[PDB]
C-alpha cells in the first residue's frame, strides 16, 4: 500500500536523484507535510530549497499530488516556483526556489509592521489569489507561515500541499483542512465552501500582522474553532492602532456570510492597498536587518 503509492508517484515525478547535483543539505524548517532544506547546486554554487515529505507520515497521502499539479500548472510572480520533483526512497522531494528572506511569521512575532508594509503584503497575496481563484484553485492554508520573502522583500505564497480545485463539476470543497486559528467559519461548520476561505484566512493574517498573533491564540485549537464558528467576527486586540482605511479593508475580509465576503479581485481595488510600498519597504523587517 505504501509501496503501491511509491509506484504511483514514480510515474509522475522526474526521473533520478537530485543528490547527484546538490551538496550541503541543511535543514531550515518544518511544516505539516515534512521538512525544508537548503542545498547548494554543485555546478553553479547557487542555493535552492528542497521540500522532503515522507510518504509514511502523511494523514492523507494523496494530497502529495497537489505539489505536482501546482508545479506543472500554475506558476506566477507571487508564487514560489517549483523546479523538479523526485522520489528518493520513501520520500517525495521537491526542488524549488529558495526564499532566503524567510517566512512572514518571523517578522510578525518580532517587530511591528506599518501600514505601508501590511498593505504591500496584502497586495502581493491578493495578486496571487485572484489568479489562483480565477482558475479554481483554493490554497486553504493562508497564514504568515505560508508567506515567504526574497532578500529584497518580494512576497510569495508557498506550501500548496493542502490546496484543492473547484470548477463547474465540483463547485465546492468539503474537507476539514487548514490551521485552526485561521480556518473560515463555514469551513469549521462543515458547509461546502469555495475560494472565500482564503479571504477569511487572509483577514486573520492581517490580525497577525497587526497584533503579532491570530485571535484566541491562548486557547487550545478546538476551543478556538468553536469560538470562530459561533461568535461574531474576531476583533483586533488593538483597534486604536489601525487607520480606518485598514479597519474598512479588514471588514471586507472577516465576513461571516461567505457570499458577502469580498473576493480577491474586488479587494485589489480597495483603497487600503493604495498605501502599499515597494518590496524595498519590507526589507528592514527581516531578521538580518533588524
Amino acid at each position: 500500500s505504501h509501496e503501491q503509492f511509491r509506484a504511483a508517484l514514480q510515474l509522475v515525478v522526474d526521473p533520478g536523484d537530485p543528490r547527484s547535483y546538490l551538496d550541503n543539505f541543511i535543514k531550515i524548517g518544518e511544516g505539516s507535510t515534512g521538512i525544508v532544506c537548503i542545498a547548494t547546486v554543485r555546478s553553479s554554487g547557487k542555493l535552492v530549497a528542497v521540500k522532503k515529505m515522507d510518504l509514511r507520515k502523511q494523514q492523507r497521502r494523496e494530497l502529495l499530488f497537489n505539489e505536482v499539479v501546482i508545479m506543472r500548472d500554475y506558476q506566477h510572480e507571487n508564487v514560489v516556483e517549483m523546479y523538479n520533483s523526485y522520489l528518493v526512497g520513501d520520500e517525495l522531494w521537491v526542488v524549488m526556489e529558495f526564499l532566503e528572506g524567510g517566512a512572514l511569521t518571523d517578522i510578525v512575532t518580532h517587530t511591528r509592521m506599518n501600514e505601508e508594509q501590511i498593505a504591500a503584503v496584502c497586495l502581493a497575496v491578493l495578486q496571487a489569489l485572484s489568479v489562483l481563484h480565477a482558475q479554481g484553485v483554493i490554497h486553504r492554508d493562508i497564514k504568515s507561515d505560508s508567506i515567504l520573502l526574497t532578500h529584497d522583500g518580494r512576497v510569495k505564497l508557498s506550501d500548496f500541499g493542502v490546496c484543492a480545485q473547484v470548477s463547474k463539476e465540483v463547485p465546492r470543497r468539503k474537507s476539514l483542512v487548514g490551521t485552526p486559528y485561521w480556518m473560515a467559519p463555514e469551513l469549521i461548520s462543515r458547509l461546502p465552501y469555495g475560494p472565500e476561505v482564503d479571504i477569511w484566512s487572509l483577514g486573520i493574517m492581517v490580525i497577525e500582522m497587526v497584533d503579532g498573533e491570530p485571535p484566541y491564540f491562548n486557547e487550545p485549537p478546538l476551543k478556538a474553532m468553536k469560538m470562530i464558528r459561533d461568535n461574531l467576527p474576531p476583533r483586533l486586540k488593538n483597534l486604536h492602532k489601525v487607520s480606518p482605511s485598514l479597519k474598512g479593508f479588514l471588514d471586507r475580509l472577516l465576513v461571516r456570510d461567505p457570499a458577502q465576503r469580498a473576493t480577491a479581485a474586488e479587494l485589489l481595488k480597495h483603497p487600503f492597498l493604495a498605501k502599499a510600498g515597494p518590496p524595498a519597504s519590507i526589507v528592514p523587517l527581516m531578521r538580518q536587518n533588524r
Partner: peptide
C-alpha cells in the same frame, strides 16, 4: 499551535 490539519 501553528500546525495544520489535512
Amino acid at each position: 499551535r501553528r500546525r495544520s490539519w489535512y
